[PDB]
RNA sequence: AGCAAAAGCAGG
């Protein structure tokens, strides 16, 4: 039937860290995937990358 | 005496091209490697490119690969830089400088001489 | 009275961009379709683009598809054309004109009005 | 585990 649920897993990359707002997700499962070297007007940010 | 006067800059539109020229006089040109180093208003300078004496060993920043092409002509003792696909963040004052040594990798990018001008878009 | 004065042209380098503007006055702008037509020195003009009254139906020449973008603003009663990836052969004198009808496909591209300027690269 | 709800999926 059309009503039925289908389940799956979803991976969407993310810069902003968790633990700033751990209430927003009680459901996520955050990994670390290293750095991405963002370029700001001065220097380089080099923030980590989480998934 | 050693002086570096650059030109060719001006206003352009995003996604365009520009051909920066640098004329050096006063020293032995073919012996020393050359560098382009830019500075955005507010942020300290960042090296743009380093080019060899032979013109065969060239190196660019991690954010400008594929968009830029540095070269030099030893006859008129001059330095050419072709900037294509100008991003809005490349809007800074560009600088032409003459390396301490004749190398490119020996030592971190720092210079010991004067400067000319640079335009902004 | 009806007058078409255009500007925005100039020198550029191959692979750059250009933004041509055309200001028309004296008639009802939103009613009539508009056309950009260029002319190379020596060859009769060739139509570049035809733009609708709604600004939704646009058509370009078979050799400028993907490189150009025509648009219009009804407030100032003006016509804009953004050219990217300037080929060396697109170097011609551009013409801004106001179609006989408010349509694009009804009838072959020919105009009955005045002209401004067009630059060359 | 999840989805989402005053009941169902998470295969038959």
From Swiss-Prot, chain A:
Q: Describe how it is modified after translation.
A: Phosphorylated on serines and threonines by host kinases, including human casein kinase II.
Localisation per UniProt entry: Host cytoplasm; Host nucleus
Listed under subunit, the entry gives:
Influenza RNA polymerase is composed of three subunits: PB1, PB2 and PA. Interacts (via C-terminus) with PB1 (via N-terminus).
> Which family does the record claim for this protein?
Belongs to the influenza viruses PA family.
Q: What does this protein do?
A: Plays an essential role in viral RNA transcription and replication by forming the heterotrimeric polymerase complex together with PB1 and PB2 subunits. The complex transcribes viral mRNAs by using a unique mechanism called cap-snatching. It consists in the hijacking and cleavage of host capped pre-mRNAs. These short capped RNAs are then used as primers for viral mRNAs. The PB2 subunit is responsible for the binding of the 5' cap of cellular pre-mRNAs which are subsequently cleaved after 10-13 nucleotides by the PA subunit that carries the endonuclease activity.
The protein's name: Polymerase acidic protein
Biological source species? Influenza A virus (strain A/Northern Territory/60/1968 H3N2) (Influenza A virus (strain NT60))
Gene field: PA
């Amino acid at each position: 039937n059309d009503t039925d649920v289908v389940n799956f897993v979803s991976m969407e990359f993310s810069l902003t860290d968790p633990r700033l707002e751990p209430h927003k997700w009680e459901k996520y499962c955050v990994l670390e995937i290293g750095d991405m070297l963002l370029r700001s007007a001065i220097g380089q940010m080099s923030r980590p990358m989480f998934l | 005496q050693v002086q570096l006067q650059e030109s060719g800059g001006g206003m352009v539109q995003p996604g365009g091209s520009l051909r920066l020229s640098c004329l050096a006089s006063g020293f032995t040109f073919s012996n020393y490697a050359m560098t382009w180093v830019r500075q955005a208003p507010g942020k300290g300078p960042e090296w743009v490119s380093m080019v060899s004496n032979n013109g065969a060993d060239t190196t660019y920043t991690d954010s400008v690969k594929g968009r830029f092409t540095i070269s030099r002509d030893n006859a008129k003792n001059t330095l050419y830089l072709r900037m294509n696909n100008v991003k809005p963040e490349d809007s800074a004052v560009y600088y032409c400088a003459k390396r301490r040594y004749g190398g490119i990798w020996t030592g971190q990018p720092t210079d010991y001489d004067y400067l000319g001008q640079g335009t902004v878009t």
